[PDB]
């Protein structure tokens, strides 16, 4: 994408989303990041939407194949699960590489830095979902460390209803439950997040209230599933 203007890549990412062409969307956003400039709030959301949808489809396919493989236990199911797994790892490595070169280091405002560290935690979490080898513990710890740094900044710099702070807590709680084998930590985090957001809703406008309550409902949905 080196020969395409930044603004054209952003415009085409928006078109790709409307056309449900998420692989294209992600490629356009990778090209935009590689222009080297910081991303605005809207552009950060395009980057996240694109890769979350690409890896989300890979994760769903990996889970279908992993289920078939486990029931089976010729080489074909394992080979094909491995192929999908390698592709998934490649996309996660690409996102992590964009964050490391150089989105995080240039992000000084709390909103941008938390957003990118939340992404970093998420893509290490997706790597941890498929990990089995000598580095699996280190992948889990890399997710934990990114989420923890994001949490520390969010608690110092953002109100408890801020949607990025809430989504971060939601995802870190999923990490605790599904990756770290820490269901109590997951439940505690989701509960305290929900309750502290509830107590700050009175400060919000109607549109901000809608955003915060939407994520609070996701927290509540998980708590209902986990308890």
């Amino acid at each position: 994408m080196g020969s395409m203007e930044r603004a054209s890549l952003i415009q085409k990412a928006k078109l790709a989303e409307q056309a449900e062409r998420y692989e294209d969307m992600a490629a356009f956003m990778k090209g935009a990041v590689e222009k080297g400039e910081e991303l605005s709030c809207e552009e950060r959301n395009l980057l996240s939407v694109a890769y979350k949808n690409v890896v989300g489809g890979q994760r769903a396919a990996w889970r279908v194949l992993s289920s078939i493989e486990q029931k089976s236990n010729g080489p074909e199911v394992r080979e094909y699960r491995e192929k999908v797994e390698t592709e998934l790892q490649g996309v996660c490595d690409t996102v992590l590489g964009l964050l490391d070169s150089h989105l995080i280091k240039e992000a000084g405002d709390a909103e941008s830095r938390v957003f990118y560290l939340k992404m970093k935690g998420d893509y290490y979490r997706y790597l941890a979902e498929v990990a089995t080898g000598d580095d699996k513990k280190r992948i889990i710890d890399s997710a934990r460390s990114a989420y923890q740094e994001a949490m520390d900044i969010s608690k110092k710099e953002m109100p408890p209803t801020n949607p990025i702070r809430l989504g971060l807590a939601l995802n870190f709680s999923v990490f605790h439950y599904e990756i770290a084998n820490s269901p109590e930590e997951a439940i505690s985090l989701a509960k305290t997040t929900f309750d502290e957001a509830m107590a700050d809703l009175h400060t919000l406008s109607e549109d901000s209230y809608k955003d915060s309550t939407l994520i609070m409902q996701l927290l509540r949905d998980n708590l209902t599933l986990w308890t």
């Binding site: 996240s48 939407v49 939601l170 995802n171 998980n222």
Partner: peptide
């Protein structure tokens, strides 16, 4: 369970 979606929908 569920993580954050990309869009509010």
């Amino acid at each position: 369970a569920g993580s954050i979606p990309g869009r509010r929908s």
